[PDB]
Amino acid sequence: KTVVVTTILESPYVMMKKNHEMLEGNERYEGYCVDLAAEIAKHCGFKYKLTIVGDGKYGARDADTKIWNGMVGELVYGKADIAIAPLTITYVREEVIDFSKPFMSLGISIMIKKGTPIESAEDLSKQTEIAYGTLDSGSTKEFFRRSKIAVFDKMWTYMRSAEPSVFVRTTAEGVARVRKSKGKYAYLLESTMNEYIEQRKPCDTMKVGGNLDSKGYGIATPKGSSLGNAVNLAVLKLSEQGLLDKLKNKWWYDKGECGS
Amino acid sequence: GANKTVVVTTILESPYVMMKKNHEMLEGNERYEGYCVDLAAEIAKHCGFKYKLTIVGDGKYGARDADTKIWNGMVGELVYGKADIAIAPLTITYVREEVIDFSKPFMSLGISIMIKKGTPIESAEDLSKQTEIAYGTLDSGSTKEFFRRSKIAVFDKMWTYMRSAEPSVFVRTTAEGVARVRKSKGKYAYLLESTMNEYIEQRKPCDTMKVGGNLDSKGYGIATPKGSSLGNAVNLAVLKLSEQGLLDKLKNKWWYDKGECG
Ligand SMILES: NS(=O)(=O)c1cc2c(cc1Cl)N[C@H]([C@H]1C[C@H]3C=C[C@@H]1C3)NS2(=O)=O
Ligand SMILES: NS(=O)(=O)c1cc2c(cc1Cl)N[C@H]([C@H]1C[C@H]3C=C[C@@H]1C3)NS2(=O)=O
Ligand SMILES: N[C@@H](CCC(=O)O)C(=O)O
Ligand SMILES: N[C@@H](CCC(=O)O)C(=O)O
């Protein structure tokens, strides 16, 4: 009767606690999605086990093999019962798994090292001194691959062939590359993650320009799962009680690392 | 059996659905224009159905009578089988999700405050702590329900005031709330969704303003009767339109490209 929850190590959604090496089970983890999982499970009346996605990916389909990886794959192949993570609701994913109504909003955004002479996606597209890229196997990369918008398509044509690769395996790696590249790398990532990082030491990154799109994260289940309806009602209840706002404010709490 | 014209319930709410110039000699869907008229056409094209737009009889979004338990508005038209789909600025809410289905959201919004320019109010907390400036909400919608149900002290305080205020602070249509702000010399502020607030802020005579942050975060969805076979296709259409940038293009068309305040 224990529900297997797939999730991903992505700050501040799920993180290893201090001294996690002597902790066990769900108690190893903390973050927005850890708290959200506990609330959803309490409303729906299930016990659950948090498991970190084996390949560390969000989820994409191989164009050749047509196999899904990441958390999406874990749902598709029956390795998990639900995904509670910053997993973007997208058309291609909705074809193969189910999603609750969104629990958090986001859009694609630009992270620069402070002082970089870039204010917009158009700015990035019109120059070549500053490299830029995205996370592999997620919705941001797919956004650029599929876009017919001139600026974004121009960006895709550059990124897909850039050498060395501009794509990164994890968000943390993209952020580190921004920080270490003396302004010669900018990173395309979701506004949620960008805003979290902007408020943390060493306070050397910034979000610039407006978001490139508008969407949300949802709780995902395998297609047709019996859990979907109750999970969706739980998201709506927690939204209306103000609990999703409370969790956002807790995990994006500003302690004054950067200025004050 | 054979394909049948889909009955779309919607609501006369600018800029979502508006009477076209020359509507008096036009018929059918041609009578109307706006964001939801354009959206209905896109959804119908993707889903492969023909449709008839029909303005909700009672002019309401939809609420359940606590005594009779009967649903009114667009929600009621779906619940009682009078319409096949609602394409409107209909907020996705818990109590509605219990009785009808919703697509993923096609537009985001939150509850917000509209003031007459110069009114000395910056926030809901400001409103809650004074009595000179009256304030209220639309009837039979999700904003009123938000206040009625809130356990948050500031919003509970606001509800306690609004529910007993005399004369009534509630309005039957958004237009009536706008008029009350505009005519009340700063002595009425209106609680309404950020989408509608931002639209009115760009309409003549450019005398209103949104103040403060939004009080919540939610969205509008396309609604169908519970279990309707149309829901899956409509949902995928919303996602496709979102990802193609078409929803953003439509919002800019109806809010900003046509703005009258500069
Ligand atoms: N401010 S936020 O992104 O934490 C945030 C974002 C969102 C919230 C709640 C919060 Cl707190 N709830 C809404 C939900 C309420 C109902 C209407 C839309 C979904 C279903 N989703 S959202 O609009 O994606
Ligand atoms: N900027 S906006 O409100 O017009 C707006 C708002 C939204 C859009 C698209 C636009 Cl253009 N799409 C998203 C949709 C994309 C997928 C993720 C959440 C739903 C399904 N809904 S939203 O986040 O409510
Ligand atoms: N939230 C994204 C991952 C991050 C990104 O692609 O920027 C997804 O669900 O794929
Ligand atoms: N969108 C709201 C109506 C507007 C409001 O309540 O402010 C609803 O679906 O009830």
Same domain, A42 and A114: no
Same domain, B119 and B182: yes
Q: Distance (Å, rounded) from C-alpha B183 to C-alpha B208?
A: 11
Give distance in angstroms: CA of B259 to centre of ligand 2: 22
Closest CA to A69 of A55, A80, A52, A81: A55
Q: How far is CA A256 from CA A177, A245, A260, B2, B75, in A?
A: 24, 20, 5, 64, 46
Q: SS3 sequence, A17-82?
A: CCCHHHCCHHHHEECHHHHHHHHHHHHHCCEEEEEECCCCCCCCECCCCCCECHHHHHHHCCCCCE
Contact B134, B165 (CB under 8 A): yes
Angle between helices B231-243 and B35-47 (to 10 degrees): 110
Question: Which of B94, B108, B248 lies closest to A236 in CB terms?
Answer: B94
Q: Distance (Å, rounded) from C-alpha A16 to C-alpha A14?
A: 7
Same domain, B104 and B93: yes
Q: Hey, which residues does B86 pair with through a beta bridge?
A: B9, B223
In this structure, is residue A260 part of a structural domain? no
Query: How far off is chain A from B240, nearest CA to CA, in Å?
Result: 6
CA nearest A91 in B: which residue?
B239
Catalogue the long-range contacts made by A169-177 (C-beta closer than 8 Å, 24 or more residues apart): A169/A56, A169/A135, A169/A136, A170/A56, A170/A135, A171/A10, A171/A135, A172/A11, A174/A111, A174/A133, A174/A134, A174/A135, A175/A111, A175/A205
In this structure, is residue A190 part of a structural domain? yes
Using DSSP's 3-state secondary structure scheme, residue A87 falls into coil
Asked if residue A107 has its Cβ within 6 Å of ligand 2, the reply is no
Q: Hey, which residues does B116 pair with through a beta bridge?
A: B208
Question: Which of B105, B216, B243 lies closest to A91 in CB terms?
Answer: B243
The torsion region of residue A5 among left (phi > 0), alpha (psi -120 to 50) and beta comes to: beta
Method underlying the structure: X-ray
Question: Which of A91, A239, A242 lies closest to B239 in CB terms?
Answer: A91
Same domain, A240 and A179: no
In this structure, is residue A175 part of a structural domain? yes
Give residue ranges of A with CB < 8 Å to any B CB: 89-91, 94-95, 99, 101-102, 105, 143, 146-149, 213-216, 218, 232-233, 236-237, 239-242, 244-245
- Length of chain A (residues): 260
End-to-end CA gap in chain A: 48
Same domain, A90 and A19: yes
Same domain, A136 and A191: yes
Beta carbons of B94 and A214 less than 8 Å apart: no
Ligand-binding annotation for B91, yes or no, is yes
Structure token pair of residue B36: 């939801």
SS3 helix, strand, coil % of chain B, rounded to 5?
Answer: 40, 20, 40
Same domain, B29 and B79: yes
Same domain, A43 and A56: yes
Angle between helices B142-149 and B153-164 (to 10 degrees): 110
Same domain, A119 and A191: yes
Q: Distance (Å, rounded) from C-alpha A130 to C-alpha A126?
A: 10
Asked if residue A140 has its Cβ within 6 Å of ligand 3, the reply is yes
DSSP string, B104-163: SPSEEE-EEEEEETT-S--SHHHHHT-SSSEEE-BTTSHHHHHHHH--SHHHHHHHHHHH
Q: Distance (Å, rounded) from C-alpha A31 to C-alpha A34?
A: 5
Using DSSP's 3-state secondary structure scheme, residue A92 falls into helix
Closest CA to A217 of A138, A135, A134, A100: A100
CATH number for the domain including A161? 3.40.190.10
Range of the domain at B87: 1-109+219-258
Query: For residues B34-71, b (16+ Cβ closer than 10 Å) or e, as one string?
Result: bbbbbbbebbbeebebebebebbeebbbbbbeeeeeeb
Q: Hey, which residues does B190 pair with through a beta bridge?
A: B114, B136
Closest CA to A131 of A179, A183, A193, A172: A183
Same domain, A72 and A190: no
Q: Hey, which residues does A249 pair with through a beta bridge?
A: none
Closest CA to A40 of A79, A83, A97, A71: A83
Ligand 3 atom closest to Cα of residue A70: 10
- Length of chain B (residues): 262
Domains held by chain A: number: 2
Spell out the residues 6+ positions from residue B136 whose beta carbon is closer than 8 angstroms to its own.
B162, B165, B168, B169, B170, B171, B177, B188, B190, B191
Closest CA to A59 of A16, A88, A31: A88
Contact A221, A71 (CB under 8 A): no
Same domain, B92 and B168: no
Same domain, A94 and A140: no
Question: What does DSSP say about strands A104-106 and A29-30: parallel, antiparallel, or unpaired?
Answer: unpaired
